[PDB]
Design a protein around this ligand. Structure first.
Ligand code: HIS
Ligand code: HIS
Ligand code: 4JJ
Ligand code: 4JJ
Lengths: 413, 413
């Protein structure tokens, strides 16, 4: 016998599971269309150097990578943003801006799940916080579309520019991205573990204190005290909250100075979806990354912002809230030939039903009417169309609503 | 600068290209729904042993495979059918039959394109030729849905049981699959090249002659002469053509004794889509594979049939026929704030438009009304909604159909 289980850390999607996945993706697609985003895709296989950012990120540490027979360093993508940037950089100035691009790539890791799907939404060429507003609104929209409300979830919001200043004032920008990465672990691991990693980086106790203090500031007015009420970060966050309020999602968003995210390239606003019961990891996460494309070699800086919204946590949350009823398969009609002699006519009928835009099966193998009705019920047919000899000569079939009257063929549809 | 081109043999899908892909996939999805097929998926990464069939197949020869760090032999799938079978075998008798499963997996190869998408349709648990009929009808349906007609394309049809007999009568079944694989190359390479490979296998000139002769038989009546009018293969092919005729696609299908296909596991009917101008490779291909699941270790034999329908040839054909007009992006509304002071109201309006199921952008960065209208035109907006101070106090906005009247907010939608 052959191994029936999938490769380590990977999921099979038989029909029942695939319907659940579809329910989720329909929402991501529908939301992207509602917000004017355009679909794109790129190869799951990318060059390894595309991710070599040298900042101690988990996403680069846990790369599912290998070498081709031709000796090329490749990887199954751990995230999409680098593919996006590559695509953007290749377009250059033929690319018209602003651009709003989205996708639902499978992404991979190696260390426990080794793949996940991640809805990516990104706005490109928009300097202002209106991009982040739109992005954050898209994510709430998606969650509400799935049945969640502001009671169930929210979106925490911060700016890395705050911490940028404190790192600048205590020194060298080259170390900022590495620090954000370490400081991201603060919620997870003890302060002792994070302090030591920051000290290992070569930062002194003075700057570490200031970092700690600023992560634990509770309101935007407190950030104004420490940084100034016209630090670009303050005006931006106020603009952001004002705009989200005006769109009607003020109950969904809030400030949190502890939110930095684990990715090196964020420069401005960052955000995280969360459940309001404290039970699950981040539902999504994102932010502004204005320098990435400059780092990839762009002559002109390209402002960007976006998020990723995984397919795991959201599903667990929806299951907990009882918002993932299994929805069984459906089909409009099941055509039932009275017997094999009636098959040709049954096919003709099947053609008519399908030509009208209906979803229709025909009983394929040899079986009794009563077996076929049960079969019809099992596949979730709305209607069973029995094709029998007597009715056929009257130009009719027998129709029976499952959720048996004689009907003229033209009336079936 | 970073490498902007994708990894060797792989395609990028920027928005313009992705729309073309979507047009094609919408059809595969829509067709699968019309025919009552159910979506499934499995990991692109599968165990290498899953494909070790030892019959000299191109699909196994050209495997994009590698070794994990844990020392496991894996591969990026060259086809889906083995994943399907694995999924089916794991379900066992909890699986209800017949089952009609479909997917659109990316599949890979290493040798020139190294990936392609392939619509897979498969019927499971159906002994009779009604499965093949349905499958063949689905493929024609798809092609017509894309704008092709019976003038443009057809589906060639044959049975391997014919050749099965001739191999049996001249000898040992273990060699049958290898022979089908060699005989598949007949159309491509010289008869001398195919003869030598069959002779290399250990088959004598007598059986080779008989093979050649039977591949070049032109009608079903000629196969009846050589094999008998009640060879199961004759009755099946007549049943098949009778049923396809009755469904209304008789002009789309025909017999061809040279069609064997390149895959080892086919046992009964096999078929190939083709363009009637002789310009392109196979558009799709499929057949019955009644022993595969027995070979994977099933206690009870499971009848199966299916096809794969690639995304390359079909597109070239549609391009040649001028049936792939580029269809530009569309969005219902573009909300234009008169200026930044109007942004909050513009957002509120944006919310209303989207709540009504409309697709809507808002101008995100700072720009002049006339720039924003041009922007609206460039994104293919059906309508531009200008939000200006004077109209706002009258409870109105300015609306202008792009494919400027004042309108009350409640009337916008
Ligand atoms: N790539 C990020 C999400 C993102 C998309 N765009 C910007 N950020 C992640 O995996 O967390
Ligand atoms: N796997 C086959 C197509 C197929 C699906 N089901 C049966 N056959 C191919 O790649 O050609
Ligand atoms: N980056 C990433 C890739 C794959 C999985 Cl399953 C999880 C993460 N976090
Ligand atoms: N099996 C296969 C896989 C990938 C490509 Cl691009 C082509 C083929 N034929």
């Amino acid at each position: 016998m052959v191994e029936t289980e999938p490769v380590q850390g990977c999921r099979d999607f038989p029909p029942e599971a695939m319907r659940c996945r579809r329910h989720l993706f329909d929402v991501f697609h529908a939301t992207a269309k509602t917000f004017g985003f355009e679909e794109y895709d790129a190869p799951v296989l990318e060059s390894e150097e595309l991710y070599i950012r040298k900042a101690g990120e988990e996403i680069t540490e846990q790369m599912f990578n290998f070498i081709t027979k031709g000796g090329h360093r490749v990887a199954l993508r751990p995230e999409m943003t680098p593919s996006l940037a590559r695509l953007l950089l290749g377009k250059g100035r033929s690319l018209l801006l602003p651009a709003k691009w989205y996708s639902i790539p499978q992404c991979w890791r190696y260390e426990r799940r080794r793949e996940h799907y991640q809805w990516n939404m990104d706005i490109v060429g928009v300097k202002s916080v209106s991009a982040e507003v739109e992005l954050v609104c898209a994510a709430c929209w998606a969650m509400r579309s799935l049945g969640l409300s502001s009671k169930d979830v929210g979106i925490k919001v911060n700016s890395r520019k705050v911490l940028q200043t404190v790192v600048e004032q205590a020194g060298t920008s080259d170390k900022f991205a590495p620090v954000c990465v370490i400081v991201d672990k603060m919620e997870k691991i003890p302060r002792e573990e994070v302090e030591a990693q920051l000290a290992v980086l070569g930062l002194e106790p003075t700057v570490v204190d200031a970092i700690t203090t600023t992560l634990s500031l509770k309101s935007i007015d407190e950030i104004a005290q420490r940084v100034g009420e016209e630090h670009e970060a303050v005006k931006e966050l106020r603009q952001f909250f004002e705009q989200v309020e005006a769109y009607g999602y003020g109950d969904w968003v809030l400030f949190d100075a502890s939110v930095v995210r684990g990715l090196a390239y964020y420069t401005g606003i960052v955000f995280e979806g969360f459940d309001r019961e404290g039970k699950f990891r981040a539902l999504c996460g994102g932010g502004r990354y204005d320098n990435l494309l400059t780092t990839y070699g762009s002559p002109t800086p390209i402002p960007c912002a976006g998020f990723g919204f995984g397919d795991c946590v959201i599903v667990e949350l929806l299951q907990e809230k009882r918002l993932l009823p299994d929805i069984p398969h459906v089909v409009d009609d099941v055509v039932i030939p009275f017997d094999e002699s009636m098959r040709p006519h049954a096919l003709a009928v099947l053609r008519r039903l399908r030509d009208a835009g209906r979803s229709a099966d025909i009983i394929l193998d040899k079986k009794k009417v009563v077996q076929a009705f049960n079969y019809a019920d099992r596949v979730g047919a709305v209607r069973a169309v029995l094709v029998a000899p007597e009715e056929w000569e009257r130009g009719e079939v027998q129709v029976k609503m499952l959720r048996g009257f004689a009907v003229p063929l033209d009336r079936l549809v």
